[PDB]
């Protein structure tokens, strides 16, 4: 369960990501598609070339959603309501895949912001992304 110390850590770490959030969202997808090829089954329609506009757009949108969740960490179900509806009713991404993206975001952050990626921050970010994933899959059935 996400604690208020975790909340503080995530606000600090995501605040430090700052303007790089969309870039890092895109890189997390790029990493996921290579490490976990089955996740490409959800993007048969995209150009998955490095640096594509579609991957960068997806990364920016996902980053904005994460920024919204970080700013609203005590009201995430409400903050992410449109997205939990979209994933439950339309996209219908198997819940297992959220773990894979989350791990790839952690790797991306570790690779780019090592000073900030302390053990405690790693633990808080992992918990936070698990929470986001739970919210996004909460309306699946």
């Amino acid at each position: 369960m996400l604690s208020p110390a975790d909340k503080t850590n995530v606000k600090a770490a995501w605040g430090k990501v700052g303007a790089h959030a969309g870039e890092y969202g895109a890189e997390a997808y790029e990493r996921m598609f290579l490490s976990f090829p089955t996740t490409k089954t959800y993007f048969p329609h995209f150009d998955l070339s490095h640096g594509s506009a579609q991957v960068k757009g997806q990364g920016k949108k996902v980053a904005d959603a994460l920024t919204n969740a970080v700013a609203h960490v005590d009201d995430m179900p409400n903050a992410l309501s449109a997205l939990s509806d979209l994933h439950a009713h339309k996209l219908r991404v198997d819940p297992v895949n959220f773990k894979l993206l989350s791990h790839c975001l952690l790797v991306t952050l570790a690779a780019h912001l090592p000073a900030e990626f302390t053990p405690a921050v790693h633990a808080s970010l992992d918990k936070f992304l698990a929470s986001v994933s739970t919210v996004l899959t909460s309306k699946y059935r």
Binding site: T38, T41, Y42, R92, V96, N97, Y140, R141
Partner: protein, 146 residues
């Protein structure tokens, strides 16, 4: 795939008793009811609005019959599931775009259906054998993904 002789005998013995078309329609319908995000691949199949509609839908039942018929055929090839399912694996990746986690969900549902139908005869060791098999089939269907 490596099965003990108790396991492979348990699988084949139970399977000869199975009404494959019926179990296939039942398992596939339950997949769509229990894990309704799996309906994403079946937009054209008609009414999937309620459990009774899903279970009674002729296209769902026809899909379950096809799927479990292929599963049944594979049970003759328990020593080389990867080779027996390679063509269908590539189809499911390249054409149908099906996340292989779906195969694992179906395996779980199929185990529940066999338990429901056979009752006490679906003993813990018979279930264990079937768990091995459904895992091996899902792994084989996932093998050609890239």
């Amino acid at each position: 795939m490596h099965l003990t002789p108790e396991e492979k005998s348990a699988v084949t013995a139970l399977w000869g008793k199975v009404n494959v078309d019926e179990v296939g329609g039942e398992a596939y319908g339950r997949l769509l009811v229990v894990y309704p995000w799996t309906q994403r691949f079946f937009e054209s199949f008609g009414d999937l609005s309620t459990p009774d509609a899903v279970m009674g839908n002729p296209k769902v039942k026809a899909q379950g019959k096809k799927v479990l018929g292929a599963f049944s055929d594979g049970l003759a090839h328990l020593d080389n599931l990867k080779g027996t399912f390679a063509t269908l694996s590539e189809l499911h990746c390249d054409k149908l775009h099906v996340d292989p986690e779906n195969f694992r969900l179906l395996g779980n549902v199929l185990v529940c259906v066999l338990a429901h139908h056979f009752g006490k005869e679906f003993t813990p060791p018979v279930q264990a054998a079937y768990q091995k098999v459904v895992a091996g089939v899902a792994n084989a269907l996932a093998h050609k993904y890239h």
